[PDB]
Amino acid sequence: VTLCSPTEDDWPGMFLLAAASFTDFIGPESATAWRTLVPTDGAVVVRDGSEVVGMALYMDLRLTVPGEVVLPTAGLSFVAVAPTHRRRGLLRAMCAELHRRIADSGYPVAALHASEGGIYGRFGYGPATTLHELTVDRRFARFHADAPGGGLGGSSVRLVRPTEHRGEFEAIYERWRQQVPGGLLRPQVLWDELLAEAKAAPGGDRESFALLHPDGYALYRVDRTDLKLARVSELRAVTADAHCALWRALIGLDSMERISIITHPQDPLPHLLTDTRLARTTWRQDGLWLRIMNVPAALEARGYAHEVGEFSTVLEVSDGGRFALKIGDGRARCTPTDAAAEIEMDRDVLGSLYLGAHRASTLAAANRLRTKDSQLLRRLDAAFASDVPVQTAFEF
Amino acid sequence: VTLCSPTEDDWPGMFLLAAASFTDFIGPESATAWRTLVPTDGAVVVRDGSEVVGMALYMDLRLTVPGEVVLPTAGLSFVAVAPTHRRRGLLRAMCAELHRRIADSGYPVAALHASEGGIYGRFGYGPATTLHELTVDRRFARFHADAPGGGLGGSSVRLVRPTEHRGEFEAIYERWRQQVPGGLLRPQVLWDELLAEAKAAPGGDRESFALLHPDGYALYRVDRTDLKLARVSELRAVTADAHCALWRALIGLDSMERISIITHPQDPLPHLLTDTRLARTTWRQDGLWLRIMNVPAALEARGYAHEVGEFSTVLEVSDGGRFALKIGDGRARCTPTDAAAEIEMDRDVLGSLYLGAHRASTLAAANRLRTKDSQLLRRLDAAFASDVPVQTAFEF
Amino acid sequence: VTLCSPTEDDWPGMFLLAAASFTDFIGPESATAWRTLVPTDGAVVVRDGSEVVGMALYMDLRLTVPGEVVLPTAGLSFVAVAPTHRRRGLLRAMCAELHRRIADSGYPVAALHASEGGIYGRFGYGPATTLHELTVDRRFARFHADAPGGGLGGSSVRLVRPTEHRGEFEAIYERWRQQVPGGLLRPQVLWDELLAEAKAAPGGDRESFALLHPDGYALYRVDRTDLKLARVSELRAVTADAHCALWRALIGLDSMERISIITHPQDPLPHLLTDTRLARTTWRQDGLWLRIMNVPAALEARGYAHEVGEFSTVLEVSDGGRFALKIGDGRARCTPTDAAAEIEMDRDVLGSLYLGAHRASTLAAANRLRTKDSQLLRRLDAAFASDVPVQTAFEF
Amino acid sequence: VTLCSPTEDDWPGMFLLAAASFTDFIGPESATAWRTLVPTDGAVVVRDGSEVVGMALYMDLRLTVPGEVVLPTAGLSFVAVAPTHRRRGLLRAMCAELHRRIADSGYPVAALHASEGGIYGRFGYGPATTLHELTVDRRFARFHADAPGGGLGGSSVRLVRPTEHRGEFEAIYERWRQQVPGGLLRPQVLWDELLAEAKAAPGGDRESFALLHPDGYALYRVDRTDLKLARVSELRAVTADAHCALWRALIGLDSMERISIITHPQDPLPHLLTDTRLARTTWRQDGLWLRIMNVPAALEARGYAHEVGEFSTVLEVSDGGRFALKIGDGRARCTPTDAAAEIEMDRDVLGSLYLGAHRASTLAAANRLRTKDSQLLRRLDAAFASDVPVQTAFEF
Ligand SMILES: COc1cccc(N(C)S(=O)(=O)c2ccc3[nH]c(=O)c(=O)[nH]c3c2)c1
Ligand SMILES: COc1cccc(N(C)S(=O)(=O)c2ccc3[nH]c(=O)c(=O)[nH]c3c2)c1
Ligand SMILES: COc1cccc(N(C)S(=O)(=O)c2ccc3[nH]c(=O)c(=O)[nH]c3c2)c1
Ligand SMILES: COc1cccc(N(C)S(=O)(=O)c2ccc3[nH]c(=O)c(=O)[nH]c3c2)c1
Ligand SMILES: [Cl-]
Ligand SMILES: [Cl-]
Ligand SMILES: [Cl-]
Ligand SMILES: [Cl-]
Ligand SMILES: [Cl-]
Ligand SMILES: [Cl-]
Ligand SMILES: [Cl-]
Ligand SMILES: [Cl-]
Ligand SMILES: [Cl-]
Ligand SMILES: [Cl-]
Ligand SMILES: [Cl-]
Ligand SMILES: [Cl-]
């Protein structure tokens, strides 16, 4: 029972484990395409002895963080342990090896989407974005007098077939992802999957349609069983006008009773309507999880709020070093020190703070970060806050 | 069909309207007690001609706002129009008269809880606090190693009968309400109702119990139909230690599968657990609504964030005046001006900003506040943010 | 095991059987009051040997039939056989004896409400009125421009406490029942029950309210578990204006999502709205059942449609005689004959035709009435039709 | 943004709009076949400027009305406005143009099936047939002694594969449609669709079977998720014997708990059983909607009840002319007049009366038709009633 990088002959066995582990498994053809995102030595397998009983890999990603800074990011995925080999330390062994490789490769951060919420905190990952499902009872929905694009003339939005406007979705998304913390570059094989999923499937999903604006798009489909529910699979808007225009069109889906979308807590949609309550939050969950691999590289790469005045402190990460952290003029400097720590936190907690989705004060109230100075808390809060709201790009 | 302050003889007819309008009507005896909170001329009725077909009143309240400042507050309630007299302008006439009286009396703010979300925005009220229901599957709940109060020895929390510790709940609450934005002074007749509701009722609620800590309490009861659900009706904690201790006790309710609570978006509970996902957000809604009656008095009374540096701007409220607004050193100065507006918003929008629950940027993205300067937005965001998270005290 | 009229000492045992047989049993006090509606020798019991194992009775009622003619009517009720004595012929023996007594007493018709639909047809009862539940989604409900009482000024409807306006409900109902086929005189002990049921009950129904118009009233209550549903227990309108006015008030119940009512198939409510579909038929069932005791007395007492021209036929009822039936000028003459039958039907079928709720053609298509002449069918159809729609007064 | 007849190049864009608007869209191949039912200039499109944002058409149909008279009928269908172009007057503009064309072409009536009930009344369409879903708990179902075809020997009904007996279904249906008000000629491309829908589909409907009698057929299938429910998609019976025989066979579906069918309010099925209650009405909705295009042509073409004696009146349709209406000997004469109106109604109301499904009295009680003479009401009621019950042929 040993651990190594898979050879070509291991992949059929990995796909078997994948099929048995993931109910949404994209299948061997598509998985084989996604292998193009996995660097050489980006994967590990555990063989029994013979067959594969554990696996994990990372993909090369590009993550936007506050200040519109794009970081090379190791995206952990395809993680599975056979049901025959539970409680044998296989996950811990696989994660340790990949983390070794990721750090040595020079990635400042790693990221993943969690199947369950109790697994990845012990390996240094903190939840860093928040998924927020809104369900709109569109039959009652009326736009506020203040809402953009209500006046006379035509609409700027077109109802189109997704496959015929791939180039335009790509361009809009590429713009979106570079300006939003949480944004990920979406490579071509992921655009292949997305448009493949836009098609109707016998006994599966219904056909998807798109609403296209120069500065935004929405992909939606009627739910397979609830025929009065339209599910927006993706809405990417680069301006506020595009966002409002797209929502006017979606609320114009007169066949539907309800429109649902997985969005973020700061989505302005509720405020576009005369009754903000009609945009019901029906589900809330962690999105992207972050493990800061190199504390000073990560903290220095990020932009910080200009509103907070220059301050200096000493931050200890529980097994990640102690640093003199100086933040001013929207930038941080983060250098080694053995001076007494003013702030202490586990590595995962820093991941949760990093994109601005959780407040230091909130984590402090849970005692997940310790400081004896409340002014320092207020300052961290303000400094780490993100000007542009944090969003979740796509699952991987 | 005319409008006036009710005489003693009008109250039976008001209670009839109340019983027919409010399914949770507290009843004539209790309502008669709550009349002690209504000042002379704090109520209006519309009679047909004969009988009462419309009513509304306000109560004298004390609202804590950021900076731990307590404002006299007119709490609109007991608002009803007979089903026989809809679409007759009775609400608009009643609200206009009470607002006249409230302004003339010198209240800087009015507040209410909304039965529906589409009614009160046109009368200048903006939703200002957010209710967040968390449902915990306590069978899986395990506290994080970092969570306060996990070590050896005894517990600081006692399981008690609510009626035998009224004095202690009052003292704890009084402490809580003075330090939390959204806090309301709870007068004695409301403590009477609360403890009356703590009792079992034939065919109604089950008996309530309390968990009591020196610096916090929780009132809870098993749900009447779902006998594996405990509903926490109220949890007031003055320290983080009290909050964690109370949640350790609640999660020790081994008969239950689930614990539910109506709390706020920044409740640190999820971070107390190894699996933050177990604290499921199962419901989200507007709580307290605010109408700023006097813009400069309200804006000057409030504390602002010290982190943001001094700045000056010109704010116009749509039918509420234009002001030179200077914010520095955590205080605002707000004086009349006819200089060009740099920020414009409806009166309700200011109410929504006032306690720090909604961000100016978010409202701007919906075009509910207009400015052509994004630096000004960032500054408003930071300035109006609340250090202590905004909470909802009690419904009225 | 024998059959006789109960003595005073039998009633406790009857109430025991009643309590065990009827989940809506009104209880011993109320049942003792309803005994005032049972004539001397109007009840039978079967004793074992000792205890009561079967019972049945009739009450003296007054039934309005087409032509506004009021008939003395034997209302069968309180019918029960002990679960220990099923399939022993007790029901058949009890019904035969009461029918003997009812016929000998001079009642031309008997009537009942059926617990199950397969029991009473063999004893000569046909379902004669139809219950039609409408559920209105009142949030979308808008009255048609043509609907009565939409203009300026006040409302004619008042929201009142049921107990304070008993006299007015009685007068309105008394008017209603005399002009509607299916109408029943409601005696004082039934008005006692109705107003007793209007009260809230601990762990039971919520408080009832009333909407009162000079020519109509509605009694309604919020549903005990579905707090967004108002159930109209009774709506009696003597004019169309009263009916529309009452429905405007009910649709003005702005707290509710839905209003439900048990009404009749010809209720004009759906046509009062711009979207007739919003008045959803959510349930349909037989109401009053009728056994014609004396065929010629019943048929001659009834009014018939003036539109159909004079015709003559020969009707045979399967064990109820053969008659020369001449119908003209809205009246029938029904005399014995041994001439060949042109129409044949079981006795129950005639009951179903009698108030005009079922068409002869429809029953003919099922072969429940046989004739070889389709012109005769059309004529029966038209003649037996009721000008005023058939309604159900109250359950007994 | 302009309106015109589509060219061949517009159809792909229409199919896109169709796919996005109609969840039951039959698809481009089938839709292309149904184009054969659309006459030259029977369609309109609204283009933006470029793409199609609105569409509507009519098909050439043949509608049976009372008296077994068959009328050329314009069947409105394929009506859609893009969700991007709501509230822009596009529907009103499209309907006005098609109505102009339909009238000028010489159609006396137009018809449609409504997606929602609040849309088409303002354009002159009244609901004219009523869909009535019956659900039979067949495990308790026992046929009445009187029911046809209960005796010894064989059955007249055969269980067959739908595709192998198309000719016989066509012949039976053709007979049915000519004798029933509401009947529509079903052209070959609709028989193509029907038999295509009879096939099982991967992840869709189960296989359909047929029960075939010389004078009737039923098409049924087991429900895809509820495997104890058989849904009768169509039952067409030309005699009562065929109808009863088919229902005996359906109730012989011993694997099923329930049989459901969309039928009409006068279906004799309930009366075929000993317990009429077992035929539960589980759903009720408007079926065919009718717009009378030419009032005198429509009213004169129809047969009327012979039972009512000759009468004359003056009918005004709100923007459709005033007519001297003389009805006698089952025929009407309808000529222009400026004499005072005795009856007034909107055009849609006349559509609702036309096939005999709604009574003039009922509509009068809602004030949807005004007259000051109740004898005239009774006469209209009787005259417009249909001897043969009104049914709904098929959706289009
Ligand atoms: C090289 O192939 C790759 C590489 C990376 C990702 C994927 N997928 C998208 S997957 O196989 O369908 C896939 C992978 C991991 C999952 N993990 C889960 O916890 C879960 O629920 N579903 C999952 C589905 C394929
Ligand atoms: C002087 O008596 C007062 C004064 C102030 C408040 C109250 N109540 C607590 S109440 O009558 O039960 C009450 C009042 C208003 C309501 N409004 C609603 O929209 C609703 O849903 N319930 C409501 C219940 C009694
Ligand atoms: C002399 O006392 C009488 C006389 C006549 C009627 C009544 N009731 C109203 S009852 O007892 O509650 C009652 C009686 C019969 C029922 N039959 C049913 O099939 C059923 O479901 N409920 C029933 C309820 C009391
Ligand atoms: C020329 O092609 C035609 C012509 C006429 C009809 C049809 N169809 C049967 S359809 O496209 O599937 C179709 C059309 C209209 C609809 N309208 C609705 O409100 C709805 O719910 N479904 C609908 C489905 C195709
Ligand atoms: Cl990126
Ligand atoms: Cl930033
Ligand atoms: Cl998002
Ligand atoms: Cl306070
Ligand atoms: Cl503050
Ligand atoms: Cl709270
Ligand atoms: Cl009567
Ligand atoms: Cl009559
Ligand atoms: Cl009724
Ligand atoms: Cl036809
Ligand atoms: Cl006819
Ligand atoms: Cl039908």
Side-chain angles (χ1 to χ4, degrees), chain C residues 114-119 127 132 144 146-148 240-241 243 265-269 271-277 280-286 289 306-309 346 348-349 352 358-359 361-370 374-375 378-379 381-382 386-389, chain D residues 114-119 127 132 144 146-148 240-241 243 265-269 271-277 280-286 289 306-309 346 348-349 352 358-359 361-370 374-375 378-379 381-382 386-389:
Chain C
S115 61
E116 312 163 38
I119 300 161
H132 203 95
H144 202 96
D146 289 342
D241 280 349
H243 174 81
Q266 296 299 325
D267 195 316
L269 174 60
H271 304 292
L272 257 22
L273 311 174
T274 55
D275 186 350
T276 62
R277 216 136 108 180
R280 257 152 48 252
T281 305
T282 51
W283 185 76
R284 253 284 220 76
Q285 191 158 112
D286 47 274
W289 291 56
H306 286 89
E307 284 64 53
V308 57
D346 289 349
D348 70 304
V349 176
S352 288
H358 304 274
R359 294 177 59 197
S361 305
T362 302
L363 289 154
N367 197 240
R368 293 286 274 123
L369 78 85
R370 275 82 54 194
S374 61
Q375 175 177 236
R378 295 197 301 281
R379 284 167 174 179
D381 260 18
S386 181
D387 169 46
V388 181
Chain D
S115 61
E116 312 163 38
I119 300 161
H132 203 95
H144 202 96
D146 289 342
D241 280 349
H243 174 81
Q266 296 299 325
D267 195 316
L269 174 60
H271 304 292
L272 257 22
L273 311 174
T274 55
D275 186 350
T276 62
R277 216 136 108 180
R280 257 152 48 252
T281 305
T282 51
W283 185 76
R284 253 284 220 76
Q285 191 158 112
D286 47 274
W289 291 56
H306 286 89
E307 284 64 53
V308 57
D346 289 349
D348 70 304
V349 176
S352 288
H358 304 274
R359 294 177 59 197
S361 305
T362 302
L363 289 154
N367 197 240
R368 293 286 274 123
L369 78 85
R370 275 82 54 194
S374 61
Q375 175 177 236
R378 295 197 301 281
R379 284 167 174 179
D381 260 18
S386 181
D387 169 46
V388 181

Side-chain angles (χ1 to χ4, degrees), chain D residues 28-151 153-311:
Chain D
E29 271 206 284
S30 289
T32 292
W34 287 44
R35 286 178 60 194
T36 63
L37 309 178
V38 182
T40 304
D41 302 314
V44 298
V45 293
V46 179
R47 284 182 221 102
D48 195 29
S50 58
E51 305 166 330
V52 20
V53 296
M55 63 189 188
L57 60 82
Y58 72 88
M59 296 172 294
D60 186 69
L61 308 176
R62 290 289 179 282
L63 172 63
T64 299
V65 309
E68 295 191 343
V69 169
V70 182
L71 298 180
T73 298
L76 268 286
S77 190
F78 216 72
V79 177
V81 174
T84 51
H85 290 256
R86 301 291 183 196
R87 304 306 95 94
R88 215 84 75 73
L90 258 45
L91 180 65
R92 181 172 288 279
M94 282 184 304
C95 285
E97 174 61 17
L98 287 180
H99 287 159
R100 194 188 64 71
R101 298 183 185 187
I102 285 158
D104 292 351
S105 295
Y107 286 97
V109 304
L112 58 82
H113 285 258
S115 61
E116 312 163 38
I119 300 161
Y120 290 107
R122 73 177 78 83
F123 301 115
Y125 293 84
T129 76
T130 301
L131 301 176
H132 203 95
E133 189 183 53
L134 293 175
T135 299
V136 183
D137 192 337
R138 62 145 299 282
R139 294 170 306 172
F140 303 101
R142 285 151 174 189
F143 284 85
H144 202 96
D146 289 342
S155 186
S156 42
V157 180
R158 304 189 281 142
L159 197 225
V160 300
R161 283 205 137 84
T163 53
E164 298 171 19
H165 302 261
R166 176 174 168 147
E168 284 137 287
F169 300 144
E170 287 178 0
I172 289 163
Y173 177 91
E174 177 63 9
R175 286 201 274 148
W176 174 87
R177 72 93 181 172
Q178 292 176 276
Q179 62 181 43
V180 176
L184 291 173
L185 186 160
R186 174 139 65 196
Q188 292 302 313
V189 300
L190 294 221
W191 282 109
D192 293 346
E193 277 307 296
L194 186 60
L195 267 30
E197 287 163 11
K199 313 204 179 211
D205 292 335
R206 304 174 89 83
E207 193 187 357
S208 292
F209 301 98
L211 296 168
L212 181 63
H213 184 268
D215 304 322
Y217 66 88
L219 272 38
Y220 76 91
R221 82 199 333 151
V222 174
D223 185 82
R224 61 154 74 77
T225 56
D226 188 339
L227 275 24
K228 297 292 161 102
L229 171 60
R231 291 194 183 281
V232 176
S233 51
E234 184 161 306
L235 177 338
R236 258 80 227 220
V238 173
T239 64
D241 280 349
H243 174 81
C244 186
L246 290 161
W247 273 107
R248 288 189 185 275
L250 290 159
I251 289 177
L253 262 12
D254 292 7
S255 312
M256 301 293 108
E257 293 178 350
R258 284 160 285 111
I259 314 295
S260 70
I261 185 176
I262 296 164
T263 185
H264 62 100
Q266 296 299 325
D267 195 316
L269 174 60
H271 304 292
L272 257 22
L273 311 174
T274 55
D275 186 350
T276 62
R277 216 136 108 180
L278 292 173
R280 257 152 48 252
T281 305
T282 51
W283 185 76
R284 253 284 220 76
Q285 191 158 112
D286 47 274
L288 228 219
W289 291 56
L290 243 47
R291 179 175 201 282
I292 279 32
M293 304 298 305
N294 182 322
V295 172
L299 289 188
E300 292 199 347
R302 216 210 106 142
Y304 297 86
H306 286 89
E307 284 64 53
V308 57
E310 188 160 70
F311 69 100

Side-chain angles (χ1 to χ4, degrees), chain B residues 195-279:
Chain B
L195 267 30
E197 287 163 11
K199 313 204 179 211
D205 292 335
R206 304 174 89 83
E207 193 187 357
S208 292
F209 301 98
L211 296 168
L212 181 63
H213 184 268
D215 304 322
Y217 66 88
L219 272 38
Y220 76 91
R221 82 199 333 151
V222 174
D223 185 82
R224 61 154 74 77
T225 56
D226 188 339
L227 275 24
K228 297 292 161 102
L229 171 60
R231 291 194 183 281
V232 176
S233 51
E234 184 161 306
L235 177 338
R236 258 80 227 220
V238 173
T239 64
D241 280 349
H243 174 81
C244 186
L246 290 161
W247 273 107
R248 288 189 185 275
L250 290 159
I251 289 176
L253 262 12
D254 292 7
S255 312
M256 301 293 108
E257 293 178 350
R258 284 160 285 111
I259 314 295
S260 70
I261 185 176
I262 296 164
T263 185
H264 62 100
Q266 296 299 325
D267 195 316
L269 174 60
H271 304 292
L272 257 22
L273 311 174
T274 55
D275 186 350
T276 62
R277 216 136 108 180
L278 292 173

Side-chain angles (χ1 to χ4, degrees), chain B residues 136-151 153-208:
Chain B
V136 183
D137 192 337
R138 62 146 299 282
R139 294 170 306 172
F140 303 101
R142 285 151 174 189
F143 284 85
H144 202 96
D146 289 342
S155 186
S156 42
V157 180
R158 304 189 281 142
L159 197 225
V160 300
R161 283 205 137 84
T163 53
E164 298 171 19
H165 302 261
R166 176 174 168 147
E168 284 137 287
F169 300 144
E170 287 178 0
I172 289 163
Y173 177 91
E174 177 63 9
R175 286 201 274 148
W176 174 87
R177 72 93 181 172
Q178 292 176 276
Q179 62 181 43
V180 176
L184 291 173
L185 186 161
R186 174 139 65 196
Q188 292 302 313
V189 300
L190 294 221
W191 282 109
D192 293 346
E193 277 307 296
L194 186 60
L195 267 30
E197 287 163 11
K199 313 204 179 211
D205 292 335
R206 304 174 89 83
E207 193 187 357
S208 292

Side-chain angles (χ1 to χ4, degrees), chain B residues 66-67 302-305 385-387:
Chain B
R302 216 210 106 142
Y304 297 86
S386 181
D387 169 46

